[PDB]
Backbone:
């Protein structure tokens, strides 16, 4: 089993990964807010929905059951 | 306002940021699952809770209202 020193090093790495996740989420949200479309038609809203489903599906495929919820956060933030 | 070409380039960048977010979430979850403690006492569970609150607080401070929910996903995944 892992020593306290090995657990130490892994907790340090999780700290740095949370920094990287937060950095990338901030960058994604800034870009999204800059580009998110103006007045939409129903046809245009349909194109957006299809893209959001792909993103939700991708997150589900990659990380499993929490994927949809994580994608949902990012989509809400990006408006 | 942004041209279709500028929006293009930004959508490409969001694709690549979702890849980086997913990569880091997978790495964080693998490390977390490898290190997450065995039998805990109540005192030990108290130390964990205090660490989880710091993480929740950090995510709230950095990204705002969705921070707690995002932290909650990562904590659930990491068990």
Residues:
């Amino acid at each position: 089993p892992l020593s306290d020193a090995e657990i130490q090093k892994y907790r340090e790495e999780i700290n740095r990964l949370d920094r990287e996740i937060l950095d990338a989420v901030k960058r994604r949200t800034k870009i999204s807010q800059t580009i998110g479309k103006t007045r939409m038609s129903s046809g245009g809203t349909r194109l957006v929905h299809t893209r959001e489903v792909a993103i939700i599906n991708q997150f589900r495929e990659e990380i499993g059951e929490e994927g949809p919820a994580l994608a949902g956060i990012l989509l809400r933030m990006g408006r």
